[PDB]
Amino acid sequence: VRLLESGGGLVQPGGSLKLSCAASGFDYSRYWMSWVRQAPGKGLKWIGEINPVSSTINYTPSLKDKFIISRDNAKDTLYLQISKVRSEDTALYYCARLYYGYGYWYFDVWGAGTTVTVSSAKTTPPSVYPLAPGSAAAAASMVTLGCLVKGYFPEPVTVTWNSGSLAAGVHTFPAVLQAALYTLSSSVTVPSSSWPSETVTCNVAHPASSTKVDKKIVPRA
């Protein structure tokens, strides 16, 4: 049973966007399905729900057609159309599956949920900077590194090291917005014997910007 929802993105004020949740591994019918959204820092707020034959669809208190919810029981998919979007819509949208024990419904199985961003700023490729120890590098037991992914918009960027195969000692702070542009950093801590001597590669990717880059960290000169 998988709930995979796509369609999120970066729309600009006043826009629209059909979010889509596709289901796998269990009969799509017989089921009720509903969307729930979480705005950053903030909490979960139910958006709406819809039944099998989509003969019933209810929303939380919203204006006329702020939200249109539908499902297609032939493509085992649930949609959610938002319109005339403001920043209060800037959020992470989850789809669920609805069930009950005694009969007081809960949100049974969630999905990973796509992300909507509501802004004016334009998509923008990030700059990747290798962060190598200074020259007065107090080369001890362990040695810390990382690369600086700055200058991009929107979220997300994703960063791994040497392709994941370097997963312990990895700190990946969150991005901080400022001046219509995102910025974040990453740390990688490995053994002194381990580094200068091999190849530590930090790999940034900005789906939106349509980019990918593996900055090879290498010794200050």
Partner 1 sequence: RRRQLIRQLLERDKTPLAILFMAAVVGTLVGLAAVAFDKGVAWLQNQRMGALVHTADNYPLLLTVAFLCSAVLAMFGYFLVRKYAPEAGGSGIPEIEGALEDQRPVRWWRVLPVKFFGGLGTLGGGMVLGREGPTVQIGGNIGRMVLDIFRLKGDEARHTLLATGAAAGLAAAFNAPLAGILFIIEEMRPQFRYTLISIKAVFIGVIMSTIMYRIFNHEVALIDVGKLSDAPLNTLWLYLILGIIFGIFGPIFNKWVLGMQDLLHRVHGGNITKWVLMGGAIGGLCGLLGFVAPATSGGGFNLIPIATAGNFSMGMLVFIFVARVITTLLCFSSGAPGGIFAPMLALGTVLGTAFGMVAVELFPQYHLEAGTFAIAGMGALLAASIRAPLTGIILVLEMTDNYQLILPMIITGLGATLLAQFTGGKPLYSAILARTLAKQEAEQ
Partner 2 sequence: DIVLTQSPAIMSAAPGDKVTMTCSASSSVSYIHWYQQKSGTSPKRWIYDTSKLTSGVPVRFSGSGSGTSYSLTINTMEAEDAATYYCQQWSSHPQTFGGGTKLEILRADAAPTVSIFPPSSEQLTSGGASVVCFLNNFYPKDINVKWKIDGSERQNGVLNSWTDQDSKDSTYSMSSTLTLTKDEYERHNSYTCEATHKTSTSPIVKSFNRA
Q: Residue from 1, 55, 135, 140 that binds partner 1 (CB under 8 A)?
A: 55
Q: Residue from 1, 30, 63, 101 that binds partner 2 (CB under 8 A)?
A: 101
Strands 114-118 and 9-11, how do they pair?
parallel
Q: Please identify, among the stretches 24-32, 81-89, 141-149, 191-199, the one whose residues bind partner 2 according to the rule CB under 8 A.
A: 141-149
Is 173 a binding residue for partner 2 by CB under 8 A? The answer is yes
Q: Please identify, among the stretches 10-18, 72-80, 101-109, 191-199, the one whose residues bind partner 2 according to the rule CB under 8 A.
A: 101-109
Q: Residue from 21, 28, 113, 154 that binds partner 2 (CB under 8 A)?
A: 113
Q: State which residue, 88 or 102, has the beta carbon closest to partner 1.
A: 102
Is 164 a binding residue for partner 2 by CB under 8 A? The answer is no
Dig out the tokens for 58 from the structure: 């209810």
Provide long-range contacts, Cβ within 8 A and 24+ apart, for 27-34: 28/73, 28/76, 29/73, 31/97, 31/98, 31/99, 32/97, 32/98, 32/105, 33/71, 33/78, 33/95, 33/96, 33/97, 33/98, 34/69, 34/95, 34/96, 34/98, 34/107
CA distances for 86 relative to 76, 90, 120, 208, angstroms:
30, 7, 11, 21
Give the one entry of partner 2, partner 1, none that residue 52 binds, where binding means its C-beta sits below a cut-off of 5 to 8 angstroms depending on kind. partner 1
Binding site for partner 2 (CB under 8 A): 36, 43-46, 58, 60-61, 94, 101-102, 104-113, 127, 129-136, 144, 146, 148, 150, 171-176, 178, 183-185, 187, 189, 220-221
